């Protein structure tokens, strides 16, 4: 049951003619391996790909090791390096042992940051901006969970290679409900941030937060009161270099305690919809929330893992403006929203629409506010969000989502998509993605607003189609077009003939691959290849490009 597979062939503008010679190995019932010579003509060598799948009591795991001993192109374009060898190490592991132990591994290592722009995208993508290196061992019982985690990142951009990593990390949760009318939670964390660069601050953070809530519910109403008590302690070292240049002095040791008060309420109204559709019911769902958190000055704390969050309809009701625990903006706000739903005679939801806003009584200031807003509004109804999902029929369906910000004075982000999908073999979809240039200037780094490839923003229209022919073929296509530059971003074609035993496949894709800054334009890549194997396979063909298809229903 061990032997060579049928060879796979491909032609790419980056690689010229490629050839695969895979060999399967059935080591055991729970383990198997694959050794693939990958001959590349432009590089003129053989990259060895080693693939290993295993199933154990700990969980399921995949490992991949690609090694190219020498490189002509990298040697030409890096003539001064010691060696031109290229390599990739990937390890994925997910397992739950004995119902309580959780093991997670997601490790990727590359020799150089230009690896994924030049090689196959089996366990990576050219769109990836970095490689993730995560280990996690946790113990979780029904009212408790602890997790020791290590997170590291390999940043591919050469503009600035300085990424923080929390090498030790300890997450502890303790839940205890029905303590009288109240429910109780406690969250603990201990994290050590270390940076790749030797002249940047290194931190140890200890966080504790109790939380007590009173839920109250009826058939129509719900009121939830919550009181949370955050306490964080920072030990910062190796901060001479930062203090040598900045005016805001990072402190050696800091500690900060904040009370947070939250009130959530929601109602449900129902009516019969006999005027339009007899037997259908319409539900109107108001929701309100009040959040209070006093202002603390975080100027002397470096921002390690705090970033701005999206404000979708559901994101209007979050209690946090930044992720992580470095930046916690003071809040004195009330948020309101309405959700309308329609149910048919079978009590199946067919349509829902949501709209909401966030009213700030006082400005949400964190002491290190450097976001470049378009204008200077600080209070009032500042953020608006809206969502919709209409199921027109069993084979039709559209979703939409829009976000408006007055501080940007513009629609920050919106998206939409309509799908016709009679089945996985045959379907059509059109989607649109937008992200305004003001939002990119406000949230992304400073150099994004000046770079040509980033300053414009995002505006793409995508179309995906799939249609079988004579129930042996399966024609698949996709096209994505950026209207700001009026340029193609990604397109592909796929034709597969599935026989009783063998299935032949031919695929083409042209995608954005990089940015040539010598001339200030984009560099594309073409790839036409055929593979043979021993359904009509539309779904994996739809997933073969850099902008994979997603079911919208």
């Amino acid at each position: 049951r061990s032997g060579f597979l049928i060879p796979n062939a491909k032609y790419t503008t980056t690689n010229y003619f490629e050839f695969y010679l895979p060999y399967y190995w059935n080591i055991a019932p729970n383990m198997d391996a694959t050794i693939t010579p990958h001959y590349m003509h432009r590089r003129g060598n053989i990259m060895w790909e080693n693939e290993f799948r295993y199933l154990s009591q700990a969980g399921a795991g995949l490992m991949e090791l690609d090694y190219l001993p020498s490189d002509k192109v990298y040697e030409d374009e890096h003539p001064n390096d010691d060696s031109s060898r290229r390599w990739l190490f990937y390890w994925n592991h997910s397992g739950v042992m004995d119902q309580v132990w959780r093991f997670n591994v997601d490790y990727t290592k590359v020799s150089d940051p230009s690896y994924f722009n030049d090689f196959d995208n089996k366990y990576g993508s050219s769109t990836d901006g970095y490689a993730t290196q995560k280990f996690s061992v946790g113990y979780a019982v029904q009212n408790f969970n602890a997790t020791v985690s290590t997170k590291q990142f390999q940043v591919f951009s050469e503009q600035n290679t300085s990424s923080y990593s929390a090498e030790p990390q300890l997450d502890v949760n303790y839940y205890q409900n029905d303590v009288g009318p109240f429910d109780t939670r406690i969250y603990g964390q201990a994290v050590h941030f270390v940076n790749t660069r030797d002249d940047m601050p290194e931190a140890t953070r200890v966080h504790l937060e109790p939380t007590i809530n009173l839920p109250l519910s009826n058939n129509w109403g719900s009121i939830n009161t919550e009181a949370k008590f955050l306490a964080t302690h920072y030990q910062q070292t190796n901060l001479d270099w930062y203090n040598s240049r900045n005016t805001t002095k990072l402190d050696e040791s800091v500690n900060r305690v904040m009370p947070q008060f939250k009130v959530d309420g929601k109602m449900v109204f129902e009516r019969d919809m006999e005027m339009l559709a007899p037997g259908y019911t319409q539900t109107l769902e108001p929701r309100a929330q009040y959040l209070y958190v006093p202002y603390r000055d975080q100027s002397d704390i470096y921002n390690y893992d705090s970033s701005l969050l999206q404000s979708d309809y559901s994101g209007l009701f979050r209690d946090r403006t930044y992720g992580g625990l470095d930046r916690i903006a003071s809040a004195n706000q009330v948020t309101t929203g309405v959700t309308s739903r329609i149910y048919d005679d079978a009590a199946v939801e067919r349509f829902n629409i949501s709209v909401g806003q966030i009213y700030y009584f006082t400005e949400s200031r964190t002491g290190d506010d450097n976001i470049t807003w378009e204008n200077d509004d600080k209070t009032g109804s500042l953020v608006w969000a809206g969502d919709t999902y209409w199921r027109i029929s069993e084979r039709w369906g559209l979703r939409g989502g829009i976000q408006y910000d007055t501080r940007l004075d513009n629609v920050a982000t919106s998206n939409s998509s309509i799908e016709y999908r009679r089945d996985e073999d045959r379907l059509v979809q059109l989607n649109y993605h937008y992200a305004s240039p003001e939002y990119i200037q406000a949230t992304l780094p400073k150099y994004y607003s000046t770079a040509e490839q980033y300053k414009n923003g995002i505006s793409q229209v995508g179309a995906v189609a799939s249609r079988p022919i004579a129930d042996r073929w399966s024609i698949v296509g996709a096209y994505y077009y950026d209207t700001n530059a009026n340029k193609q971003a990604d397109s592909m074609l796929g034709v597969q003939y599935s026989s009783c035993c063998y299935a032949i496949r031919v695929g083409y894709e042209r995608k954005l691959n990089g940015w040539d800054n010598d001339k200030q334009h984009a560099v594309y890549d073409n790839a036409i290849g055929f593979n043979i194997e021993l359904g009509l396979g539309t779904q994996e063909m739809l997933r073969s490009n850099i902008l994979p298809y997603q079911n919208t229903l």
């Binding site: 904040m258 009370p259 006093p294 202002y295 603390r296 000055d297 975080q298 100027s299 003071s330």
Partner: peptide, 17 residues
């Protein structure tokens, strides 16, 4: 980060003062 006349009994106010 701590102010001059901050108090540890005044958490609910801004800057504990």
């Amino acid at each position: 980060a701590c102010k001059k006349g901050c108090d540890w009994l005044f958490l609910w106010h801004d800057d504990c003062a």
